[PDB]
């Protein structure tokens, strides 16, 4: 053929779907705003959590001392006296 009859549909192939572009734009806005709200919530967390000491890793002694309160140097004076019988 001639030049323009091919350059026309060439440019038309080069250009994209606008419906896809609009859908992607509204989508991206939706999830970006949702993620923005999520990050805003995340930044509100205090440095020290409400539980803190309640956490099992932050006790480390309520389940260690009971198995140590029997060794010498930690016993209540009234433990060795009546342990004989």
């Amino acid at each position: 053929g001639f030049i323009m009859e091919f350059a026309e549909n060439l440019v038309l192939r080069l250009m994209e779907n606008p419906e896809e572009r609009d859908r992607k734009a509204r989508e991206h806005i939706y999830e970006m705003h949702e993620r923005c709200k999520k990050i805003k919530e995340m930044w509100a967390l205090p440095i020290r959590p409400y539980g803190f000491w309640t956490f099992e890793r932050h006790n480390a002694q309520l389940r260690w001392d009971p198995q140590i309160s029997q060794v010498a140097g930690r016993r209540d004076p009234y433990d060795d006296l009546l342990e004989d019988n």
Partner: protein
């Protein structure tokens, strides 16, 4: 007028480049081809691209919608 004149060749040299000896080319510059081909591609792509592109815009769309709406 009737007399032919003088000054067989116009004075001065184009682009100040001295003419080469007869039988030899102009010895094109090292950037001459890469930039001339660039100019050629730009001219052709603007000529055939800006015209073969669809005339989609907001002026023509508003024109069509104003013609269709003014009748009512």
């Amino acid at each position: 007028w009737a007399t032919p004149g003088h000054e067989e060749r116009p004075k001065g040299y184009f682009m100040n480049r001295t003419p080469p000896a007869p039988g030899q080319s102009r010895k094109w510059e090292d950037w001459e081809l890469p930039c001339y081909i660039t100019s050629f591609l730009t001219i052709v792509i603007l000529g055939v691209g800006l015209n073969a592109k669809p005339d989609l815009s907001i002026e023509t769309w508003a024109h069509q919608k104003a013609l269709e709406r003014l009748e009512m």
